[PDB]
Amino acid sequence: TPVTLAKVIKVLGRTGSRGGVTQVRVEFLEDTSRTIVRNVKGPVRENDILVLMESEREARRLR
Amino acid sequence: PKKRASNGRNKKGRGHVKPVRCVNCSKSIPKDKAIKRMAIRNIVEAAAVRDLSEASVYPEYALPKTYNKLHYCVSCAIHARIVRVRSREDRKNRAPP
Amino acid sequence: VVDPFTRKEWFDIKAPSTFENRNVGKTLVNKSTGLKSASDALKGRVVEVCLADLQGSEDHSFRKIKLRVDEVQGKNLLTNFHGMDFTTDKLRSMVRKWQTLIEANVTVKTSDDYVLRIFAIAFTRKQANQVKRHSYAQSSHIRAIRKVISEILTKEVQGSTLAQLTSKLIPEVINKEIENATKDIFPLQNIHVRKVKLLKQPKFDVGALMALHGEG
Amino acid sequence: SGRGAPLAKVVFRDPYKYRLREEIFIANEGVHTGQFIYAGKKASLNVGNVLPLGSVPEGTIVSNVEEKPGDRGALARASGNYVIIIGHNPDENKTRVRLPSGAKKVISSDARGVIGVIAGGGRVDKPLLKAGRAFHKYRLKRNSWPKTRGVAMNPVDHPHGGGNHQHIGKASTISRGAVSGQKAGLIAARRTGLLRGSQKTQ
Amino acid sequence: MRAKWRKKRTRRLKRKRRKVRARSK
Amino acid sequence: SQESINQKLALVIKSGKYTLGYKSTVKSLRQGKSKLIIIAANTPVLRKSELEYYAMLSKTKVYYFQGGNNELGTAVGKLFRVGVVSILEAGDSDILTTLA
Amino acid sequence: AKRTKKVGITGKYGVRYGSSLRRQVKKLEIQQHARYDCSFCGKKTVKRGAAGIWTCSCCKKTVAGGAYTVSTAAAATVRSTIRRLREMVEA
């Protein structure tokens, strides 16, 4: 399956209207030079890995 | 009364200036008026430039930019949060930040 | 329910010998059949290329050229000039505020019947000691600049043909020509012969073309 | 007589004999005595000269254009009318032109046509004001004027006919599958009424 | 209301009364 | 870059030696005197050709005015119309060494 | 002297036929009885006979044109379009 693992790089801010959503950058965890910024659901810090169904959508702000 | 001396924008000696059209709403709006900006951008997004140059032949040749002027309606300008009302004294600052 | 590309061919472009890169492209057509020769259509195609991609350089990564197909031979097809241009990116990069603009244009036939409209653009600038912020002009200056531009463009185009001008404008001789001609009045940054437009062609003349070509 | 569009009496040297072959070209809005008219494939594209259609470019106009090569002139023949060229396709040499009704017609490039538009101009903007000028007009053409109305004629004389009131009774639009004696009114009317607008073909 | 439409309404009324008056020539 | 033929014509009037109208022009051009003819635009090609022939026989110069005979008469300073003018002593102008 | 505020020539039609039509006629009647200017002799001796052809009564040359006026505006556009194409061709 084309599923990805990616470890956090840094926190970016809490977005969306109700602020449940947060922004996070991750490192691809096998291509360290390749990073990606995305949106998440819940409590997050650095140094945690995320299982990604896409590595391309390259999310951005949200309300 | 006169909320603004110019009433408007830089006519002051002209009588008539041809109009333009708000790129958002298409309203007619004189060029003296009609907020004017410039949308300078690289086409590429920073998130993509890595894959871009990796796939790019002509290695490190250049990267062009997008150059676009943008007239605006007043109402649109305000609803864009692009321009906004200002304190009375603050209304004469003819500079950006 | 066909897979057309399992009917199609591949034709190698071969451009003039006045350039450098001639392995310019490959393009496909449906196979020539009865009552239908793919060449009949391929004779009319037109292609667009960066002059950088042509001459190997990247210093011409902004101008560009149109090439019209003229002939075919043995899975390979010969082109010829069809027009020049100037890219929008560079155009608006050049075109900023606080510098008056000028544009002129003329139309003339070569020594040969290859009639061309040719445009010229110019901006004003300041000279190294200036403080005011707009740097504009007067209409006398503008009119005389337009005049000289037209005269020079005509003088260069008449005594020449397409190949002459192609070999001029790859090295770009003519903007420096205008610069040397115009250093009297005004610096005039961003002088550029930016666009030419074919208006007419003579009889096709396979021979001139295959004389131009025919190497490697 | 019976025409706008004045006539032009051209004389040509007969190629194959010492004589002249005087002709009747329609005047084409600029013509005048002492003038020369050129005819040919190799003729100048000025006004009055007559040329094939492959021999002239797109956008050009012409009058008196033939519908077939050698019918000595058919179309764009009345006053103020003209036909516009809009294309060539040398696959079968077919020119494509636009006709005063607003019609697209595809014909032979070797078809001929005289360059310009026909005189007379706005003959039809001025009102006649009255019966007498209509009378003289239709005198010089044909006995179609005056014109009585079926709603005043008798049922024996018209299908509209009938009595106790000037009226018809049934539709005034008459299916083209119909036949003689029934064909009084509108024929194949794809609609009817007051209309808009304002092009004919597209 | 609005002055432009008072004006339009009065113009309508002028037309109407003038028609009613020229009824009697 | 250019001087107006109209002013030059006024000059040739006020100073130079000359005459008007086809007949006098041909008289002068037959006596071989006139140095410059001016001819309008509207005039018959036949008369234009006749005058051109007389000029080429007299070794005389020609100008083809860029306008009609009414305007030529206007410019030579009248209120009727003239097709042609003849000049025997091109006067205080220098038309002879112009493009003419 | 003046003899008529407006109708002029339309007085031949008296009280008849409607004012709209008489005005629409007045226009064209002036146009056609107008002694126009000749492109050839330059004079003003050009008058209609036999609607569609106008004669210069001195140079004798006839010219074809509109019925009531010499040039139709569409005919002038035609001449322009034609010379444009003539140049683009010959050149």
Added chain:
Amino acid sequence: NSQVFGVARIYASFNDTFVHVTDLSGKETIARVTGGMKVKADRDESSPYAAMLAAQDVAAKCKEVGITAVHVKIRATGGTRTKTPGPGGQAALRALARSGLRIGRIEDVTPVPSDSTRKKGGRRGRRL
């Protein structure tokens, strides 16, 4: 430089994204697809997920025929319209890159008028 080359016209309105891949000329198109071809949602017709998902199969086809390298021209609606593209443009572009098709000579050819005909809206404009 054993890459064989094509060109890619990308056209991003605020409603849809058009990918279009052809030879170095316009004719003999190679691939063409939209966001609507991948979703029948009607508002996501310009979704950049859709543009990505379209560029995927476009590059697939360009390879299956045998193209390797691309030049790219791009445009908005233009004329007398926005002049600005939607978000899907850039995502389809990056998806092309990620597909592996090598790239060069990026350029914008969106149409621009010298003050051409009137615009829609009627002096007072499409108010939401």
Added chain:
RNA sequence: GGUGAAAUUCUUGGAUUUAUUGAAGACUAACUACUGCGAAAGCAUUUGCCAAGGACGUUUUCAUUAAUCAAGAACGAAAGUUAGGGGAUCGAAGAUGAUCAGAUACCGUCGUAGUCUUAACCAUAAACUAUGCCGACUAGGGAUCGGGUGGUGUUUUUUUAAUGACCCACUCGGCACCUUACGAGAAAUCAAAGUCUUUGGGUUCUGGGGGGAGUAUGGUCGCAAGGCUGAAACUUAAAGGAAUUG
């Protein structure tokens, strides 16, 4: 395609998208703007012809000719009307999909007149600088357009020259502008609405509670729509400026 979301609509006749060629009519982008010109309305592609005009250089040209103005006359956006040509887009009317309690309205699609021009008419707009014209003075301030004064300057290169524009300042008619306010005006504001109760610089129009009513009435101009002029009866105790709290 189009939307906030959809729908109407177009699509094996292969739409949209792609390339080429063409035609038409309109519009003159960006560059390029407290900048331009102009009695006002107003005016952007180029060139040529036509006249015209302000401002200036100005030891030139004449001698009080002149300033505002009833009557009277010219010009006069757009829309609008009459008629020819034109008719691409845009688009009242109109026809249609949605929404909505309803929507003959906003949104969407098409579309007539018109939008363009020609020949006539009209003659008004927040036709607003809602602020006349000419002169004297009040601080500066710096920009800046057009015009007029110097640099043992800059660069343009040739051997410097030369013009040349730029700058440095010197300088005038400018569109105008910033802080202050001395004066004025509650106040907003006014390089001028300043020059005034210490009341008068030449000077023309309109203005006098609100409405009724820009109606009626007539007259007059107009193809008409309508305009200019223009009341009264009757009715009635009011509407705005700034700023404060909400």
